Amino acid sequence: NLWVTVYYGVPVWKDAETTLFCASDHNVWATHACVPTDPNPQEIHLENVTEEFNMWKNNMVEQMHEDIISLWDQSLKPCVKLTPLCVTLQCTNVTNNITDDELKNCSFNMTTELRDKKQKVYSLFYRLDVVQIKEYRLINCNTSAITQACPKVSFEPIPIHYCAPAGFAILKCKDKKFNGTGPCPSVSTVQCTHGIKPVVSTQLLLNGSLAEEEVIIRSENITNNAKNILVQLNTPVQINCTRPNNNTVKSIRIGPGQAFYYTGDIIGDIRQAHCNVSKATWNETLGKVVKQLRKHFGNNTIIRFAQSSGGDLEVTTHSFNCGGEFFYCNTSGLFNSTWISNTSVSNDSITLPCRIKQIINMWQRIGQAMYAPPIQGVIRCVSNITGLILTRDGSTTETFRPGGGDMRDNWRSELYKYKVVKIEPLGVAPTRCKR
Amino acid sequence: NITDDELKNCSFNMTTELRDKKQKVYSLFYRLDVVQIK
Amino acid sequence: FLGAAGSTMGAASMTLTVQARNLLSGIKQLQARVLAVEHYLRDQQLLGIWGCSGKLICCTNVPWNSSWSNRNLSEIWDNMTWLQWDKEISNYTQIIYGLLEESQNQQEKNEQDLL
Ligand SMILES: *[C@@H]1O[C@H](CO)[C@@H](O[C@@H]2O[C@H](CO)[C@@H](O[C@@H]3O[C@H](CO[C@H]4O[C@H](CO)[C@@H](O)[C@H](O)[C@@H]4O)[C@@H](O)[C@H](O[C@H]4O[C@H](CO)[C@@H](O)[C@H](O)[C@@H]4O[C@H]4O[C@H](CO)[C@@H](O)[C@H](O)[C@@H]4O)[C@@H]3O)[C@H](O)[C@H]2NC(C)=O)[C@H](O)[C@H]1NC(C)=O
Ligand SMILES: *[C@@H]1O[C@H](CO)[C@@H](O[C@@H]2O[C@H](CO)[C@@H](O[C@@H]3O[C@H](CO)[C@@H](O)[C@H](O[C@H]4O[C@H](CO)[C@@H](O)[C@H](O)[C@@H]4O)[C@@H]3O)[C@H](O)[C@H]2NC(C)=O)[C@H](O)[C@H]1NC(C)=O
Ligand SMILES: *[C@@H]1O[C@H](CO)[C@@H](O[C@@H]2O[C@H](CO)[C@@H](O[C@@H]3O[C@H](CO)[C@@H](O)[C@H](O[C@H]4O[C@H](CO)[C@@H](O)[C@H](O)[C@@H]4O)[C@@H]3O)[C@H](O)[C@H]2NC(C)=O)[C@H](O)[C@H]1NC(C)=O
Ligand SMILES: *[C@@H]1O[C@H](CO)[C@@H](O[C@@H]2O[C@H](CO)[C@@H](O[C@@H]3O[C@H](CO)[C@@H](O)[C@H](O)[C@@H]3O)[C@H](O)[C@H]2NC(C)=O)[C@H](O)[C@H]1NC(C)=O
Ligand SMILES: *[C@@H]1O[C@H](CO)[C@@H](O[C@@H]2O[C@H](CO)[C@@H](O)[C@H](O)[C@H]2NC(C)=O)[C@H](O)[C@H]1NC(C)=O
Ligand SMILES: *[C@@H]1O[C@H](CO)[C@@H](O[C@@H]2O[C@H](CO)[C@@H](O)[C@H](O)[C@H]2NC(C)=O)[C@H](O)[C@H]1NC(C)=O
Ligand SMILES: *[C@@H]1O[C@H](CO)[C@@H](O[C@@H]2O[C@H](CO)[C@@H](O)[C@H](O)[C@H]2NC(C)=O)[C@H](O)[C@H]1NC(C)=O
Ligand SMILES: *[C@@H]1O[C@H](CO)[C@@H](O[C@@H]2O[C@H](CO)[C@@H](O)[C@H](O)[C@H]2NC(C)=O)[C@H](O)[C@H]1NC(C)=O
Ligand SMILES: *[C@@H]1O[C@H](CO)[C@@H](O[C@@H]2O[C@H](CO)[C@@H](O)[C@H](O)[C@H]2NC(C)=O)[C@H](O)[C@H]1NC(C)=O
Ligand SMILES: *[C@@H]1O[C@H](CO)[C@@H](O)[C@H](O)[C@H]1NC(C)=O
Ligand SMILES: *[C@@H]1O[C@H](CO)[C@@H](O)[C@H](O)[C@H]1NC(C)=O
Ligand SMILES: *[C@@H]1O[C@H](CO)[C@@H](O)[C@H](O)[C@H]1NC(C)=O
Ligand SMILES: *[C@@H]1O[C@H](CO)[C@@H](O)[C@H](O)[C@H]1NC(C)=O
Ligand SMILES: *[C@@H]1O[C@H](CO)[C@@H](O)[C@H](O)[C@H]1NC(C)=O
Ligand SMILES: *[C@@H]1O[C@H](CO)[C@@H](O)[C@H](O)[C@H]1NC(C)=O
Ligand SMILES: *[C@@H]1O[C@H](CO)[C@@H](O)[C@H](O)[C@H]1NC(C)=O
């Protein structure tokens, strides 16, 4: 004798394919076009909700990859196009009255403000941004269109809060030690997330969150080799980096009100860009990693490391932003170690050789070419180390290499804690009412 | 080589990838897409 | 906003009054406030057809058929929480949705018009 009733109950906890918007806070490329950020002290803790995540399958990563590429292209719109310079550039080595031996002093023609008058000037460039044809073409005039970035915006990661649309909910477990997924018991809900920084690199994350107690290795299929194995780090490592060149930046106007910057001259101490890493700090890191890879591969396994295989240095070496300059730094002195058999496996600083480029291709979108305006003074930027990417290559011996290339894995590295639920508040539970 | 009689073999200049270098090539066109001003 | 959905059953229906007042309160962000306002509409579209016109925790007069997992509906009412029982009755939703419009809303709507 049961008579069904109708409710407005809480259990709505379905999948949420959805849109999303931001809560960020000068006209720097984020543009503050989100909302003013609320103090949102509403991590409402819930009691005993068995819910399993899937960090590898969500649309939050897919939208985040779509947002920033569209947002960073939006900052690229009002800047100077600046493609009259793809001409027959001719250069030589930098002259030093005599010595032995990364710069090219370049003879160069160009238009002026007026349409007919030409301009024979000279400037400097690096190695990897110019190609032999002595005549030297630019590196991208196969197929591109060079574009200057406007010299007022900053490429600094300004953190982005995310908030749910009006009618959905952002969920996060405060629980511990996922294997990527996991039925996390304790959970709290939020309307708005915390601030996440717009950083971008490969082979090493930086300025990120920290771990709980140890390394948390994250993957999908450890028995698959084609995965990108994520490594969460417990304790951050100070990385100092520099471009120790006192450099003079001059300015010209290429046409009708189109300014342009170029490396005029350097004051005279030709150096190489580099980064210091504390040696004894780094060996203390890797002992934690092999401590866990015994548990996932075996007690009698040999953990080897090597460099990247090949490809472009964007794939090979460490991509790295710093303060309006886009470094590329070789990291061969970081994976020259082999840990053996998983049983009884200071005041120093290793230093890496780092290169400088100016013509970039962000997220491999071929055709778009953004120019790097060289800046005056010196370069110093300090960053933590938080995230690592390793790749199991295809006996119990095993070699790992620093993988990377997809920037989605960087955002997935710092958004595994979240999920979003759709809301359908309708419950039909029978009782004995009838009337 | 000789015969009697909708195509035009056209002398033609054009830019290149670089801004200054020119390009003297030839191509073909139809009748109704080109006009006398030879 | 939300709370106590985890470990209770029926006593969660005591606090079904905060669950609506915070609810619903370029182009890519403008998909929001359209499907967000299409929701709270399309259910209240059919909620007026259920007979319960506004917000009342209310009962209809259509029978609960006991073919739909008849399991101790005084006992499971209080102990065994929601999100478990919801999967049990996840299969029989559409059929009740035909019974929301035929029992009370084909017969009984045209029985008060007799006077
Ligand atoms: C990981 O996270 C760390 C910190 O969490 C972050 O390090 C920070 O990096 C930023 C950018 O690389 C640093 O900000 C710059 O700092 C320099 C130095 O400022 C110090 O010294 C001056 C004078 O000695 C003091 O006044 C100042 O208070 C500091 O003590 C500044 O010079 C920079 O400001 C200029 O640049 C900005 C962007 O161009 C402008 O918005 C700003 O107005 C300044 O511009 C002026 O000078 C320019 C010089 O060329 C000129 O071009 C302009 O037209 C204008 O005249 C800037 O504030 C910050 O200090 C770092 N903090 C720490 C603790 O290290 C890492 O960058 C991050 N990792 C990555 C990859 O981002
Ligand atoms: C401008 O400067 C750049 C570098 O700053 C310079 O490019 C370099 O030129 C040298 C000489 O042509 C190349 O050096 C070769 O390097 C290999 C390995 O390092 C050596 O083994 C070579 O020695 C053999 O070849 C010589 C050729 O005559 C023989 O004389 C010699 O006995 C050996 O058989 C040789 O030293 C170097 O490869 C390039 N660098 C690059 C990146 O190509 C360039 O030449 C300078 N510009 C001008 C106009 O000189
Ligand atoms: C490239 O080829 C095209 C065609 O493939 C050619 O254009 C043609 O040229 C001829 C000769 O100049 C034109 O033919 C005329 O056509 C009318 C009707 O068809 C005839 O009656 C004309 O004959 C009279 O005019 C002649 C002029 O001298 C007299 O000699 C003759 O006795 C008659 O009085 C004449 O044959 C034809 O009109 C054009 N076609 C078009 C579409 O205009 C062109 O000449 C070739 N290029 C070069 C450089 O020769
Ligand atoms: C990267 O650069 C930073 C600074 O640019 C380095 O931090 C510096 O580290 C040294 C020692 O590691 C610190 O010196 C010590 O300071 C204490 C405090 O007074 C003093 O008592 C000691 O005798 C010693 O001199 C220094 O203060 C510190 N500076 C800052 C600003 O933090 C860091 O070590 C560099 N890391 C690498 C790997 O090179
Ligand atoms: C653009 O032109 C340059 C001409 O040097 C090409 O550069 C070389 O191309 C060969 C064949 O692909 C490669 O083996 C070399 O490694 C290239 N050199 C460098 C420095 O990358 C380049 O491939 C051309 N690009 C396209 C798309 O045609
Ligand atoms: C992880 O990936 C590997 C290969 O990508 C899968 O291994 C296959 O497993 C089946 C049955 O265990 C074998 O018949 C195949 O021969 C294996 N593949 C190869 C290339 O040898 C493995 O199943 C994946 N793990 C999961 C959980 O899906
Ligand atoms: C690149 O070569 C040019 C050659 O003209 C150098 O320009 C000359 O530099 C000397 C002293 O450095 C000046 O007295 C001349 O006036 C400069 N010429 C012109 C036309 O301005 C230039 O210095 C070289 N680049 C570097 C970095 O040394
Ligand atoms: C980064 O530095 C390493 C230093 O070892 C370079 O690797 C060597 O390259 C030569 C020829 O390219 C080989 O004969 C050696 O066997 C390599 N050693 C190792 C450890 O790989 C590497 O080429 C550098 N990469 C860049 C992009 O500069
Ligand atoms: C790198 O991570 C360390 C974590 O230990 C940061 O150090 C602390 O950061 C918090 C908040 O950022 C501060 O309240 C503490 O005062 C910091 N402690 C010390 C000893 O510095 C550090 O700030 C991070 N690096 C950067 C550049 O932010
Ligand atoms: C060396 O070169 C510098 C600049 O390149 C020049 O000023 C100087 O006169 C030169 N000295 C000699 C001895 O050639
Ligand atoms: C630049 O132009 C001048 C004349 O305009 C010419 O003499 C010179 O050779 C040009 N430079 C190069 C590198 O072609
Ligand atoms: C990882 O966790 C899932 C459940 O979230 C489990 O099914 C799987 O066996 C776990 N794998 C390992 C290696 O612990
Ligand atoms: C670079 O050299 C110039 C002189 O040419 C000097 O004024 C400036 O202070 C130098 N840069 C630094 C960082 O000292
Ligand atoms: C790191 O230190 C351990 C002992 O603390 C040592 O056995 C190991 O060889 C060191 N790493 C390298 C690469 O030498
Ligand atoms: C005829 O023309 C063709 C191509 O136009 C040429 O290859 C050939 O040599 C010519 N023959 C004579 C006899 O002119
Ligand atoms: C094409 O250019 C060359 C020199 O650049 C010139 O001699 C020739 O006459 C031009 N062709 C035409 C059809 O004008």
- Pairwise CA distance, residues A409 & C75, whole Å: 48
Which ligand ends up closest to the CA of A175? 12
The dihedral region occupied by A298, where left means phi > 0, alpha psi between -120 and 50, and beta the remainder, is left
- In one-letter notation, the amino acid at residue A87 is V
Q: How many domains does chain C have?
A: 1
CA A182, A187, A189, A192 torsion: positive or negative?
Answer: negative
Q: With an 8 Å Cβ cutoff, are A165 and C36 in contact?
A: yes
Q: What is the dihedral of CA A136, A139, A142, A143, to 10 degrees?
A: -140
Of A4, A11, A433, the CB nearest to C83: A11
Could you tell me where the DSSP H helices lie in C23-114? 35-38, 42-50, 85-88, 94-99
- Tokens matching residue A44: 């409402």
How does DSSP classify residue A96?
-
Q: With an 8 Å Cβ cutoff, are A87 and B20 in contact?
A: yes
Q: Are A82 and A254 in contact (CB under 8 A)?
A: yes
- Pairwise CA distance, residues C30 & A166, whole Å: 12
Chain A residues with CB-CB distance to B15 below 8 A: none
Compute the half-sphere exposure of residue A344: CA atoms within 13 Å on the CB side of its CA.
0
C86 touches chain A (CB under 8 A): yes
- Residue to test with chain A: of C1, C2, C78, C102, most A Cβ within 10 A: C2
CA angle C104, C110, C113 (to 5 degrees): 135
- Pairwise CA distance, residues A221 & A404, whole Å: 17
- Pairwise CA distance, residues A411 & A61, whole Å: 6
SS3 string, B1-38, reads CCCCCCCEEEEEEEECCCCCCEEEEEEEECCCCCCCCC
How does DSSP classify residue C13?
G
SS3 state at B18: coil
- Tokens matching residue A280: 């004894």
Tell me the shortest Cα–Cα distance from A249 to chain B, in angstroms. 26
- Tokens matching residue A79: 């800047």
Of A61, A68, A64, the residue nearest A29 (C-alpha) = A68
From A89, which residue of chain B is nearest by alpha-carbon distance?
B18
SS3 state at A118: strand
For residue C47, the Cα-to-chain-centroid distance in whole angstroms is 8
Q: Give me the resolution in angstroms, 1 decimal.
A: 4.4
Q: Are A34 and A23 in contact (CB under 8 A)?
A: yes
User: What was the structure determination method?
Assistant: cryo-EM
Q: Are A186 and A45 in contact (CB under 8 A)?
A: yes
Q: Are A234 and A211 in contact (CB under 8 A)?
A: yes
Q: Are C24 and C42 in contact (CB under 8 A)?
A: no
In the block, residue with structure tokens 């070789």: A330
- Pairwise CA distance, residues A357 & A125, whole Å: 9
Strand order in the sheet with A325-329: A318-322, A325-329, A349-356, A273-278, A239-242, A380-383
Chains A and B form CB pairs within 8 A to the count of 15
Could you tell me the distance, in angstroms and rounded to a whole number, from the CA of residue A209 to the centre of ligand 9? 11
SS3 state at A62: helix
- Pairwise CA distance, residues A405 & A412, whole Å: 13
The number of residues in chain C equals 115
- Tokens matching residue C104: 């009370």
Q: With an 8 Å Cβ cutoff, are B20 and A86 in contact?
A: no
- Pairwise CA distance, residues A271 & A262, whole Å: 19
- Pairwise CA distance, residues A254 & A261, whole Å: 10
- In one-letter notation, the amino acid at residue A157 is P
- Pairwise CA distance, residues B20 & A85, whole Å: 10
Burial bucket for residue A78 (CB in 10 Å: 0-12, 13-18, 19+): exposed
- In one-letter notation, the amino acid at residue A165 is P
- A319 DSSP β-pair partners: A328
From B15, which residue of chain A is nearest by alpha-carbon distance?
A87
Which ligand ends up closest to the CA of A128? 5
Q: With an 8 Å Cβ cutoff, are A4 and C62 in contact?
A: yes
Which ligand ends up closest to the CA of A331? 8
Segment 398-427 of chain A within 8 Å of chain C by CB = 423-427
SS3 state at A204: strand
For residue C113, the Cα-to-chain-centroid distance in whole angstroms is 27
- In one-letter notation, the amino acid at residue A271 is R
For residue A154, the Cα-to-chain-centroid distance in whole angstroms is 16
Of A182, A240, A254, the residue nearest A216 (C-alpha) = A182
Chain C residues with CB-CB distance to A425 below 8 A: 19-20, 23, 43
Query: Which of A235, A281, A384, A385 most suits a substitution to test ligand 9, by most atoms within 8 Å of the C-beta?
Result: A384
- Pairwise CA distance, residues A408 & A71, whole Å: 16
Could you tell me the distance, in angstroms and rounded to a whole number, from the CA of residue A359 to the centre of ligand 14? 40
Which residues constitute the domain of residue C4? 1-115
Query: Which of A243, A245, A246 most suits a substitution to test ligand 13, by most atoms within 8 Å of the C-beta?
Result: A246
End-to-end CA separation in angstroms for chain C: 46
SS3 state at A285: helix
- Pairwise CA distance, residues A430 & A428, whole Å: 7
Whether the CB of A377 sits within 6 Å of ligand 13: yes
End-to-end CA separation in angstroms for chain B: 20
Tally of CB atoms within 10 A around A272 = 14
| E strands in A84-226 | 90-93, 104-111, 118-125, 130-132, 136-138, 145-148, 162-163, 169-172, 182-184, 187-190, 216-218
| E strands in A152-235 | 162-163, 169-172, 182-184, 187-190, 216-218, 229-232
Chain A residues with CB-CB distance to B17 below 8 A: 86, 141-142
